[PDB]
Amino acid sequence: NATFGMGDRVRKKSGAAWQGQIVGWYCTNLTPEGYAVESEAHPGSVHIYPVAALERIN
Amino acid sequence: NATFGMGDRVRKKSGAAWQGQIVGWYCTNLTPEGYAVESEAHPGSVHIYPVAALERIN
Amino acid sequence: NATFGMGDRVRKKSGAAWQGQIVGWYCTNLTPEGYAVESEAHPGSVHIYPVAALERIN
Amino acid sequence: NATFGMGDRVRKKSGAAWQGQIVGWYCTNLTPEGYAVESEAHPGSVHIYPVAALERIN
Numbered sequence: 001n002a003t004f005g006m007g008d009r010v011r012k013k014s015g016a017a018w019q020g021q022i023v024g025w026y027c028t029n030l031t032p033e034g035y036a037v038e039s040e041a042h043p044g045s046v047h048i049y050p051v052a053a054l055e056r057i058n
Numbered sequence: 059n060a061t062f063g064m065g066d067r068v069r070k071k072s073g074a075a076w077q078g079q080i081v082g083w084y085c086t087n088l089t090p091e092g093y094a095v096e097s098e099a100h101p102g103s104v105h106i107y108p109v110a111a112l113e114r115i116n
Numbered sequence: 117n118a119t120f121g122m123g124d125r126v127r128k129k130s131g132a133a134w135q136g137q138i139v140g141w142y143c144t145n146l147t148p149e150g151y152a153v154e155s156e157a158h159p160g161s162v163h164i165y166p167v168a169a170l171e172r173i174n
Numbered sequence: 175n176a177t178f179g180m181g182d183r184v185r186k187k188s189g190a191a192w193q194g195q196i197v198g199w200y201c202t203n204l205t206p207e208g209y210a211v212e213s214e215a216h217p218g219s220v221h222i223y224p225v226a227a228l229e230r231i232n
Contacts, residue, residue: 026081073160076161122201152198
């Protein structure tokens with residue numbers, strides 16, 4: 001039901017930047033569809049974001 | 059292959075504290091088995107950790 | 117010029133929760149007045165937020 | 175008493191990567207000397223770390 005899948009390259013749409021691959025997912029009441037994204041610039045660094053904060057890029 | 063599953067209550071074993079439910083998972087080369095945990099004290103706040111940093115509690 | 121000072125007890129006003137003492141500060145173009153807050157529930161755990169996200173409590 | 179000052183360029187020494195400018199500081203019992211660092215790769219993104227995790231670079 002997934003907007004993204006593992007390995008998709010995405011970026012944060014606005015505010016503080018973040019860009020890299022989907023490496024996981026999470027689900028809470030506040031964020032029913034969330035993803036973990038490993039930075040392509042800082043290997044090993046991972047942030048989690050709601051789907052609405054991210055967009056897929058080539 | 060999962061050490062934990064969704065909804066398990068866990069806590070960080072040492073250093074900065076964290077405690078609440080598993081709400082997701084992630085996988086990188088640095089952390090091949092990682093989990094997202096929603097704080098039971100601060101609803102909506104989620105941290106991600108490697109499995110070795112966490113332990114299941116009742 | 118500080119809205120808060122070290123040791124003030126504050127909480128996040130909305131969205132994911134966070135509550136505890138001011139333990140530091142930071143400044144970027146996106147967040148020209150930001151604070152570090154140590155959770156009173158999870159000792160050692162610290163989040164940083166823009167001033168507009170926080171409010172002082174007793 | 176500061177190891178680093180505002181604007182110093184630093185990087186994380188090991189594990190997950192992080193690199194950019196010092197933009198703040200914090201102090202807790204677990205981390206009596208900590209810094210906020212804004213990523214030079216992801217503008218607006220800031221992480222906090224203990225001094226021992228960081229090193230100054232040119």
